[PDB]
Amino acid sequence: KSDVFHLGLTKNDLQGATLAIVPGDPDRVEKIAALMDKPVKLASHREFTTWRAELDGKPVIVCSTGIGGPSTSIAVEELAQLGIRTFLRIGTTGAIQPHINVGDVLVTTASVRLDGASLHFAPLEFPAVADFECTTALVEAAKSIGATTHVGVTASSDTFYPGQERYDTYSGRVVRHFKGSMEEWQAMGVMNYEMESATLLTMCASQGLRAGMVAGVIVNRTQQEIPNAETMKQTESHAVKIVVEAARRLL
Amino acid sequence: MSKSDVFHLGLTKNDLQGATLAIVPGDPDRVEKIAALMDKPVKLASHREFTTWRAELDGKPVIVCSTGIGGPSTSIAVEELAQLGIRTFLRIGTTGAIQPHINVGDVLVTTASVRLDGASLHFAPLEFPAVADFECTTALVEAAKSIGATTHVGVTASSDTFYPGQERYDTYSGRVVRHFKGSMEEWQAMGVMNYEMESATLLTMCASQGLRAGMVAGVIVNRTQQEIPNAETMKQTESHAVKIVVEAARRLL
Amino acid sequence: SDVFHLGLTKNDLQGATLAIVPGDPDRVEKIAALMDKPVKLASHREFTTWRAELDGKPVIVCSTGIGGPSTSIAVEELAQLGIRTFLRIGTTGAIQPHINVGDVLVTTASVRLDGASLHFAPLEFPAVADFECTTALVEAAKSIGATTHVGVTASSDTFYPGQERYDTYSGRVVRHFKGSMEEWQAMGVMNYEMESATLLTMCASQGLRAGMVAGVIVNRTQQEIPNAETMKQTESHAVKIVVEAARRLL
Amino acid sequence: SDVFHLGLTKNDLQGATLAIVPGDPDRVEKIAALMDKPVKLASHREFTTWRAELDGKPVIVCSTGIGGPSTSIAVEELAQLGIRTFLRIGTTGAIQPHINVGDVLVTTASVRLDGASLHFAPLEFPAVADFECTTALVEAAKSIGATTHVGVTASSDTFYPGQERYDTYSGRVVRHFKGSMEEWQAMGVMNYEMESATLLTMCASQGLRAGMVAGVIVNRTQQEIPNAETMKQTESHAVKIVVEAARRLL
Amino acid sequence: KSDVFHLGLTKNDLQGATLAIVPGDPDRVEKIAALMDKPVKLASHREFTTWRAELDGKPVIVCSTGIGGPSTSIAVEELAQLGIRTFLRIGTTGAIQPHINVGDVLVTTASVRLDGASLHFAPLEFPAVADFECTTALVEAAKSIGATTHVGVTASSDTFYPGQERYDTYSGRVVRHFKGSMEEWQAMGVMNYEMESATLLTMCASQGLRAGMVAGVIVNRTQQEIPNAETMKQTESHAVKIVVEAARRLL
Amino acid sequence: SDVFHLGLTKNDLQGATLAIVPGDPDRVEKIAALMDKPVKLASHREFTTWRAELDGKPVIVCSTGIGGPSTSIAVEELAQLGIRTFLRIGTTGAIQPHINVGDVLVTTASVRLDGASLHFAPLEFPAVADFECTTALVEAAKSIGATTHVGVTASSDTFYPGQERYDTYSGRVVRHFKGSMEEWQAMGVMNYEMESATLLTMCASQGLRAGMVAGVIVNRTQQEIPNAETMKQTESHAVKIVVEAARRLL
Ligand SMILES: O=c1[nH]c(=O)n(COCCO)cc1[Se]c1ccccc1
Ligand SMILES: O=c1[nH]c(=O)n(COCCO)cc1[Se]c1ccccc1
Ligand SMILES: O=c1[nH]c(=O)n(COCCO)cc1[Se]c1ccccc1
Ligand SMILES: O=c1[nH]c(=O)n(COCCO)cc1[Se]c1ccccc1
Ligand SMILES: O=c1[nH]c(=O)n(COCCO)cc1[Se]c1ccccc1
Ligand SMILES: O=c1[nH]c(=O)n(COCCO)cc1[Se]c1ccccc1
Ligand SMILES: [K+]
Ligand SMILES: [K+]
Ligand SMILES: [K+]
């Protein structure tokens, strides 16, 4: 009942699909699938929940990666084994630039590699760059729904707290390497923090797979720390609409 | 009073009822299994890869919370549990052994980990040892002897990937980056017992923040003998390891 | 002069914000001549500067010389003078078997095998091209009808060992670069050149727009010696693409 | 002589598998005098070796000297002669306020601020002590009755800048080690010494058992100059522990 | 027409020359060659201008490298292919020590490797050290003409601005790695900044080629930043005389 | 005692600014006997110090022990006492086929395969010897008539794996040092030793003058086990050079 080690899927479950939308959150999988025609649940194992749906009369996979590069690396690899060639990540994000507001959508051209898993596919000098066609389709899709969009570099961290220079922690300390890091990234024009893009973009770009990255701004780190409960859902829906519309252009 | 005191786990400090020890499996589906071994098991929360149950061990509240696969999610789980008052962490996992003398069904207690991860660096520079707490290690080894098991104590390679970082070539690309080509043979020669995916992060982040951490895993595959685990030995080995981690939790209360 | 090396003042640029930046100083006149009202401005060391006009708007052409260090000087001083958009036109050796001599390559991002990029951002920062610039080049290549490949470029501080050439005085390559071409090939890296890592890193980390295009004059998997006819044809072919892309970014 | 430096043969050991390894060559005679039948074997360079008997079994005491390089020579050459267990006895400077002068510290693993450890295993490999050896040292400390702390040790390749001492000739510390003592302090690192990182890495990566114990003769958060009496008392206190631990490991 | 890819020279052009003076400025080539016997233009391609001359009856090459290790590495390699075994660099420099004045001559024993190209010949732990016979000849030549000489370590940077900790720039920022780096080098006894020596000295010392390095101080970083034009040419003339005199001793 | 380890006062030195620093503590008497008025000062741990007179001027001889760590302690504490010039005399294993046993090697700079040098300057800083010291050593070698080679030395933090010795307990060499000897050989590195990188880095970055001279007792390309008598005469040859060089520097 499975051709892969973790996902619990066969090549036949995919029905010829070559594109997958890959959110971090397993609870978001159904929401993205519901936007497309005839969505069905295929599998749920660990943090990997998979749905299949129809878009413009063509099968599309939605599969969760979980938080971080390691589980992303498993999901992407096993989906690649199953036949997926195009990967579109839909994420949540904390912006670090003052001109970016909550509700804005960010398209990532390339990522700052603050992760470990990217190194298991390519040395640090290799750019965690997004596929040009995927990035184009995400930019086009953002205009299609009519959102406020920023395009640029993302800092992709193996941690939510110290690697994003959060001090509201148990220890209250940040290791020397990351002390003052946010200010450095800010000055370099880095838009935001998330936790999967570096791994995803590196492993795909170094293995002949197409990858795109899009995220909804939940919090801006220069104005607030605790997100709003209602705005969180609206921003998520906005970006989910874009990732589906982008997939339409890449079929 | 409350609904959630942390960003991800969906738990309040009040939910924990004074608990200071947590058992941290990778698989969210393993949480109920561990909690079923103790008294009064109750489901607290399920969000993302983080499933949390509360149980009673010798009259003392204990938490079971899944980390998910890998350092990044593990770092969120551990930090947010520490915010809620957890001081002791015991990881129970699955693992592939790389030494010929270690058989499937054996139990491995980790003294310290080879840091093939990225998250550990976010707490301490690479030179800092990813070392388990001595009292936690003692308890796990003592628990393994108590219920009876084939035990090996030593070093674990903790990788940020399942595939290339553990030198698996049966993949889509069929290639392994230069840095990891020939790496398994090197760890083997250095006496490293096994591969898993969370210990380097867990052990580094706890040892560098005044928290106690222990690491135990049941070997379900030996890399010199096979690649695919048996879907029965898997269940028995997990049951074996789950019994050991609860018994080690008893000694640390 | 307003700057240390270029021998240019702010007035010389006449409000220009876009520069085409070849490596070869002899290419500067060739690029300028394709545009309206081409005028020489200055020549000091490897930095030759011309000013021209594209659709009524002033544009700068300025040579960087070979390598990140002189590129970093040229880009920094042009930025000081008001340039915000940088389009590099270069020559390259392809390392993929499917890429032909005469093909044009558009760089999305570069493998940083250089030193100068590190003086602007740590290695983990991507040497990524600006999205608008890359789009302009891809559209400009599609307009003239060239065979175009889009992807990653290996940018080396060295022509020989860093590109794993063994036809050298020593005949040796340092451990770090031994087998490196094979690695890049497997990773889908299209080609080797010598300036893009520095240019892309320094621009992306300072709020400057940069694009990178190159004509293939050699494929490393078939032959090493470039033909003394295709070289001029490929250069002029890629020069037309960069000028047309500049038209879209004004 | 079967070895390059120590000046010992396989027969000189008489089947010994355990060795106590102090840094100070003047401490070898002190440790061996506490065991039955002490015999001087060889003294070459900084390596002094004494043979003793513990519970009717031959035990070796051999000085490593200060630092990883000679520790690597000593351990390797003793291993060639049949030694499978290494117990290090040293002095240390504590960096935690709750640890006092006179206290005994058992090292679980070490921060690798050394070079020699890299010659055996890459930095990511933990400089971790053998679990059985650590157990014995902790149990031996409880046996004699002493205030014991168990945890991490910073093992520096230098006495001054690597341990962030500013009372030096230059009065400066290199950028890399600036503010490093506070970093280790916040990370719960107990102390500074100069041999454990090399010893623990080279043993754990070669199937050899290694244990590490030290007496606190200075506390870095209060006073720099140690007392010329309490030093000897602490040294003699720690020696009793390492001999008692050696009994449990034979 | 050419035996090499860039320089535009054949072996015959060199006429058996084994020594080359290598300035950074292509315009310095004729000026250096004019101080010797029978000066002749050989080639000019890109930043590489080559002249041939005679010194005590022996053919000597003068060839420009351009700014930085990359073009230096090309020139030196191709000169080596054509038969050059001894390389003497004469350049300009900015001193970072208060006791070194404008107009002073500096002879480099070894260089701090703040470049990329040196790594393409030897790992960072390999010393960017000058040849003993070349260093001796330069020190002896400087004392022979009567100049204020300083011998020691040079910081060799792939960048003129941030890597030499200049803040008078478009961004006005310096990356963390190089923040406070000048003060570190100053305290370590480093004399000066230039842009080619690390590459030249590393590539020669690891390939069995002799290399020496000499430079004229035109700016002191602890004092003024704007150099005098008349003083610049005079300082260049002083250093050019020393390097030709040093070449005499090495033939 | 004004120092922590050496057990020496500023008055014990009698205003000496130069010190010859061997690795072996038994060689300290040998060098001191070559000069006028040999007097023993102190012997603690691996550090033995002897005072002598050269040309009517006081000169110190102090053992560093094997490796960077104790070398850094010795050199720092001697600098505190007033020593500004450090001349190292050691033994070495040559890795070039043209260098024979009995030859003398003067080190211009060292490959930094140590850890202690990093505690004074980052890896990019060259472990370079002082020009005057190097000049004095070369001139002294020609004065007494010895077969001399001048160049780069590999300075390792270990005797075995870092010098790619496979005749060990494990018989393995870590990936980093696998094939490393061949690399150094192609790069023209003359030899292996264990102190120069630390000595040359810590001195060149602190304003202290340092020189390095060594006697070839083995060549790695031919055989491993050296002759006994040849080892003694090579030591005496090198010691004669370092004393003659010290005469020029005072
Ligand atoms: O600041 C952030 N950093 C991130 O890495 N991120 C991506 O999702 C990571 C797991 O929530 C999302 C945000 Se936004 C946020 C702020 C506070 C609480 C939850 C999410
Ligand atoms: O080889 C391993 N490496 C690991 O890192 N590991 C830990 O669990 C990671 C998620 O399955 C578990 C094993 Se065992 C095994 C082999 C093949 C398929 C599943 C599990
Ligand atoms: O293989 C190459 N690598 C490059 O870095 N490159 C860019 O121009 C660098 C200066 O010629 C150009 C080529 Se193509 C070539 C092959 C042989 C001779 C000259 C150019
Ligand atoms: O602070 C220390 N750091 C160490 O590395 N250490 C171990 O012994 C190394 C040789 O003295 C011992 C001490 Se304690 C001490 C303080 C002052 C003088 C000698 C020892
Ligand atoms: O500070 C310096 N750093 C250098 O690397 N340098 C060498 O020439 C590099 C190209 O100008 C020369 C100087 Se001096 C100087 C100061 C200001 C403007 C031009 C030259
Ligand atoms: O190969 C060598 N490597 C070295 O680092 N070296 C310097 O002395 C180190 C301590 O003996 C000396 C030699 Se030569 C020698 C060969 C065999 C046994 C002793 C010395
Ligand atoms: K995860
Ligand atoms: K020593
Ligand atoms: K150049």
Size of interface D-E (CB pairs under 8 A): 5
Q: Which CATH number fits domain B1-253: 3.40.50.1580, 3.40.50.261, 3.20.20.140, 3.90.550.10?
A: 3.40.50.1580
Residue length, chain E? 251
User: How far does residue A90's CA lie from ligand 1's centre (Å)?
Assistant: 13
Q: What is the DSSP string of E113-170?
A: EE-SGGGGTS-TTS-EEPPHHHHHHHHHHHHHHT--EEEEEEEEES-SSGGGT---SS
Domain edges within chain B: 1-253
Q: Give CA–CA dist E239/E216, Å, rounded.
A: 6
| F75 SS3 class | helix
The strand pair at A210-220 and A105-114 is best described as antiparallel
User: How far does residue E198's CA lie from ligand 3's centre (Å)?
Assistant: 23
C175, C176, C177, C178, best to mutate vs chain F, most F CBs in 10 Å? C175
CB contact under 8 A, E187 and D175: no
Using CB atoms, which residue from E121, E158, E176 is nearest to C116? E158
- By C-alpha distance, the chain B residue nearest F172 is B189
Residue E195 CB–ligand 5 contact under 6 Å: yes
Q: Name the residue with tokens 């020989």.
A: C160
D116 close contact with F: CB closer than 8 A: yes
- Best CA proximity match to A31, nearest among A53, A7, A1: A53
| Chain C residues inside the 8 Å CB shell of B177 | 183
Using CB atoms, which residue from C113, C124, C131 is nearest to A135? C131
Which of the 8 DSSP states describes residue E7? S
All residues at 6 or more sequence positions from F211 whose CB lies less than 8 Å from its CB, including other chains: F85, F86, F87, F88, F106, F129, F130, F133, F134, F136, F137, F245
**Chain Cα centroid distance, residue D213:** 6
E207 close contact with F: CB closer than 8 A: yes
Phi, psi dihedrals of residue E63, rounded to the nearest 5°: -140, 125
CB contact under 8 A, B162 and A74: yes
Which ligand number lies closest to the CA of residue B29? 2
Handedness of CA E97, E99, E103, E109 (dihedral sign): negative
E170 close contact with A: CB closer than 8 A: no
All residues at 6 or more sequence positions from D225 whose CB lies less than 8 Å from its CB, including other chains: none
In the set E78, E165, E194, E236, the catalytic residue is E78
| Chain A residues inside the 8 Å CB shell of E177 | none
Q: Give CA–CA dist D73/F24, Å, rounded.
A: 14
Residue nearest to atom 2 of ligand 2 (CA): B96
A173 close contact with D: CB closer than 8 A: yes
Residue length, chain C? 250
- Chain E: give the shortest CA distance to residue F79, in Å: 16
Q: Give CA–CA dist B68/B77, Å, rounded.
A: 9
Q: How far is CA B68 from CA B65, B79, B96, B203, B205, in A?
A: 9, 14, 17, 16, 16
Instruction: Give the residues across from B61 on adjacent strands.
Output: B56
Residue nearest to atom 2 of ligand 5 (CA): E94
Q: Give CA–CA dist C131/A132, Å, rounded.
A: 9
In the set D76, D220, D235, D244, the catalytic residue is D220
Q: Give CA–CA dist F250/F248, Å, rounded.
A: 6
- Best CA proximity match to D125, nearest among B120, B204, B115: B115
- Best CA proximity match to E109, nearest among F13, D238, B162, F209: F209
Q: Is D167 exposed, middle or buried (0-12, 13-18, 19+ CB in 10 A)?
A: exposed
**CATH number of this structure's domain E1-251:** 3.40.50.1580
- Best CA proximity match to E153, nearest among E110, E114, E182: E110
Q: Are the CB atoms for A211 and A87 separated by under 8 Å?
A: yes
User: How far does residue B84's CA lie from ligand 1's centre (Å)?
Assistant: 19
Q: Helix E197-205 and helix E69-81: axis angle, to 10°?
A: 40
Structure tokens at E18: 């084994």
- Best CA proximity match to F240, nearest among F13, F16, F20, F42: F20
Phi, psi dihedrals of residue E248, rounded to the nearest 5°: -55, -40
Resolution in A: 2.0
Beta strands in D34-119 (DSSP E): 36-44, 47-53, 58-62, 85-94, 104-113
All residues at 6 or more sequence positions from E55 whose CB lies less than 8 Å from its CB, including other chains: E36, E37, E244, E247, E248, E251
Chains C and F touch (3+ CB pairs under 8 A): yes
All residues at 6 or more sequence positions from A36 whose CB lies less than 8 Å from its CB, including other chains: A53, A54, A55, A60, A244
First vs last C-alpha separation in chain C: 26
Size of interface A-B (CB pairs under 8 A): 166
Q: Give CA–CA dist C248/A251, Å, rounded.
A: 28
Q: Are the CB atoms for D153 and D137 separated by under 8 Å?
A: no
| F131 SS3 class | helix
User: Which atom of ligand 3 lies closest to the CA of E5?
Assistant: 18
For residue F104, what is the enclosing H or E element?
strand F104-113
Residue C159 CB–ligand 3 contact under 6 Å: yes
**Which CATH architecture fits F1-250?**
3-Layer(aba) Sandwich (3.40)
Q: Are the CB atoms for F132 and F245 separated by under 8 Å?
A: no
Q: Is D145 exposed, middle or buried (0-12, 13-18, 19+ CB in 10 A)?
A: exposed
Q: Are the CB atoms for D146 and D106 separated by under 8 Å?
A: no
- Chain B: give the shortest CA distance to residue A177, in Å: 8
Q: Give CA–CA dist A119/A114, Å, rounded.
A: 10
In the set E113, E210, E221, E238, the catalytic residue is E221
Structure tokens at A187: 């000055």
Q: How far is CA A208 from CA A64, A79, A246, F23, in A?
A: 21, 14, 20, 56
- Best CA proximity match to A189, nearest among A135, A109, A86, A104: A109
Structure tokens at C119: 């003086």
Beta strands in chain B (DSSP E): 21-23, 39-47, 50-57, 60-65, 88-97, 107-116, 130-131, 151-159, 194-196, 212-222
- By C-alpha distance, the chain F residue nearest D195 is F69
F171 close contact with B: CB closer than 8 A: no
Q: How far is CA B153 from CA B215, B216, D204, E132, in A?
A: 10, 10, 12, 55
Residue nearest to atom 19 of ligand 2 (CA): A5
CB contact under 8 A, B182 and F172: no
Q: How far is CA A92 from CA A21, A233, A237, C247, in A?
A: 14, 11, 11, 36
B180 close contact with A: CB closer than 8 A: yes
All residues at 6 or more sequence positions from E146 whose CB lies less than 8 Å from its CB, including other chains: none
User: How far does residue E28's CA lie from ligand 9's centre (Å)?
Assistant: 15
For residue A132, what is the enclosing H or E element?
helix A132-145
Chains E and B touch (3+ CB pairs under 8 A): no
D144 close contact with F: CB closer than 8 A: no
Q: Give CA–CA dist E46/B134, Å, rounded.
A: 65
CB contact under 8 A, A187 and E173: yes
User: How far does residue D152's CA lie from ligand 8's centre (Å)?
Assistant: 23
User: Which atom of ligand 2 lies closest to the CA of B159?
Assistant: 5
The residue type found at D38 is P
| E49 SS3 class | strand
Q: Are the CB atoms for B134 and D124 separated by under 8 Å?
A: no
Q: Give CA–CA dist C60/F50, Å, rounded.
A: 71
Q: Name the residue with tokens 């351990």.
A: D75
For residue D237, what is the enclosing H or E element?
helix D230-249
First vs last C-alpha separation in chain E: 28
For residue A31, what is the enclosing H or E element?
helix A29-33
Dihedral, E162, E166, E167, E170 alpha carbons, nearest 10: -60
Residue length, chain B? 253
Q: Give CA–CA dist C138/C92, Å, rounded.
A: 17
User: Is B212 tagged catalytic?
Assistant: no
Q: Name the residue with tokens 């914000």.
A: C17
Q: Are the CB atoms for B73 and A67 separated by under 8 Å?
A: yes
B178 close contact with C: CB closer than 8 A: yes
Structure tokens at C180: 């490196």
Q: Give CA–CA dist A240/C12, Å, rounded.
A: 49
Residue length, chain D? 250
Q: Name the residue with tokens 């027969």.
A: D11
Q: Give CA–CA dist B61/A46, Å, rounded.
A: 26
Instruction: Give the residues across from C211 on adjacent strands.
Output: C87
Structure tokens at C13: 């640029």
| D247 SS3 class | helix
CB contact under 8 A, E132 and F150: yes
Q: Give CA–CA dist A122/A112, Å, rounded.
A: 14
Structure tokens at E222: 């602890």
Q: Give CA–CA dist D147/D149, Å, rounded.
A: 7
Which of the 8 DSSP states describes residue D119? G
Experimental method used, please?
X-ray
User: Is C5 tagged catalytic?
Assistant: yes
Subunits close to C (at least 3 CB pairs below 8 A): A, B, E, F
All residues at 6 or more sequence positions from B185 whose CB lies less than 8 Å from its CB, including other chains: none
Q: What is the DSSP string of chain C?
A: --SSSS---HHHHTT--EEE--S-TTHHHHHHTTSEEEEEEEEETTEEEEEEEETTEEEEEE---SSHHHHHHHHHHHHHTT--EEEEEEEEEE-STTPPTT-EEEEEEEEEE-SGGGGTS-TTS-EEPPHHHHHHHHHHHHHHT--EEEEEEEEES-SSGGGT--SSSS----GGGTTHHHHHHHTT--EEESSHHHHHHHHHTTT-EEEEEEEEEEETTT-SSPPTTHHHHHHHHHHHHHHHHHHH--
CB contact under 8 A, E176 and A184: yes
Size of interface E-F (CB pairs under 8 A): 74
Q: Give CA–CA dist B89/B78, Å, rounded.
A: 8
Instruction: Give the residues across from A222 on adjacent strands.
Output: none
- Chain C: give the shortest CA distance to residue F67, in Å: 26
- Establish how many alpha carbons lie within 13 A of residue E208's alpha carbon, considering only the half-sphere containing its beta carbon: 13
Q: Give CA–CA dist C30/E129, Å, rounded.
A: 42
Structure tokens at F6: 């050496």
CB contact under 8 A, F152 and E112: no
Q: How far is CA B135 from CA B56, B132, F156, in A?
A: 21, 9, 38
D4, D24, D46, best to mutate vs chain F, most F CBs in 10 Å? D46
The residue type found at F62 is C
Q: Give CA–CA dist F72/F66, Å, rounded.
A: 11
Which of the 8 DSSP states describes residue F24? -
- Chain F: give the shortest CA distance to residue D27, in Å: 9
Using CB atoms, which residue from E24, E120, E123 is nearest to C157? E120
Structure tokens at B94: 């699955």
The residue type found at F87 is L
User: Is E176 tagged catalytic?
Assistant: no
| E96 SS3 class | coil
Query: CA angle B35-B153-B148, nearest 5°?
Result: 55
Structure tokens at F197: 């990188």
Residue A227 CB–ligand 1 contact under 6 Å: yes
Task: Write the Ramachandran bin of F96: left for phi over 0, alpha for psi from -120 to 50, otherwise beta.
Answer: beta
